[PDB]
Design a protein around this ligand. Structure first.
Ligand SMILES: C[S@@+](CC[C@H](N)C(=O)[O-])C[C@H]1O[C@@H](n2cnc3c(N)ncnc32)[C@H](O)[C@@H]1O
Length: 230
């Protein structure tokens, strides 16, 4: 347990909590869906009789995107989410906290060894539904994934936008959100987009996604931005 001076829900990012530590320094955290359990050595706080899990933006790109000024948190209580590249569940565990018992994260991951890890991190989180499969071939898991409210993509592969569009066509509800971690330098966001970056964005736009926000993640992640589209 880390001691905290206060915990209060953020005014706009529902399910996310602003935590002030001893020294007046601040963190964000989610309310633990499985009180007593720790996913990636994150620190745990207790306040008013409830347990919170620190959401460390240096280990999760979505927390980084919020702290870098992403316009809104589109992940909501009860959402069904298709998560491409779930890995061992770091960011998904916080999505699982926010969405609560009636939400679902369908977590696609293609490496058996990473899947085993995820099964071992997420064995008591029953709103996470791991799918062993390659996100390039969503037809092979169409029978396992219902309509989703949102699509979150972090597969760390070139030409991720084509994978995103293909999955969105199969699964993403009308007006569903799409959050995509993209390899990007600060200058791609602030100055002028590189060739490879521009083409990812055009692929999304050509796929009917319209870009609502983009934030670079430095220094939480020096090499990525978060693209947000609806
Ligand atoms: C950057 S890690 C994701 C980190 C995770 N999203 C988080 O925030 O905690 C990318 C993961 O995607 C998986 N991956 C790469 N290509 C894939 C593909 N075509 N389909 C499914 N998973 C893939 C890798 O095995 C790896 O675990």
């Amino acid at each position: 347990m880390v001691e905290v001076v206060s915990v209060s829900r953020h005014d706009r990012w529902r399910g996310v909590y602003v935590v002030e530590l001893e020294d007046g320094s601040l963190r964000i955290a989610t309310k633990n869906l499985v009180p007593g359990q720790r996913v990636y050595g994150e620190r745990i706080f207790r306040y008013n009789g409830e347990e919170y899990r620190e959401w460390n933006a240096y280990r999760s790109k979505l927390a980084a995107a919020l702290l870098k000024g992403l316009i809104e948190l589109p992940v909501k209580e009860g959402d069904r989410i298709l998560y491409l590249g779930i890995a061992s569940g770091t960011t998904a565990s916080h999505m699982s906290d926010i969405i609560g018992p009636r939400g679902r994260i369908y977590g696609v991951e293609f490496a058996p060894r990473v899947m085993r890890d995820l099964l071992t991190v997420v064995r008591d989180r029953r709103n996470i539904f791991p799918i062993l499969g390659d996100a390039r071939f969503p037809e092979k898991y169409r029978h396992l994934v219902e309509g989703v409210d949102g699509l979150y993509a972090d597969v760390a592969q070139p030409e991720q936008a084509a994978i995103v569009v293909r999955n969105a066509r199969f699964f993403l509800r009308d007006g569903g959100y799409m959050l995509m971690a993209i390899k990007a330098r600060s200058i791609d966001v602030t100055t002028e987009p590189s060739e490879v970056y521009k083409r990812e964005i055009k692929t999304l736009m050509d796929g009917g996604l319209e870009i609502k926000d983009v934030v670079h993640l430095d220094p939480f992640d020096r090499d990525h931005a978060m693209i947000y589209a609806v």
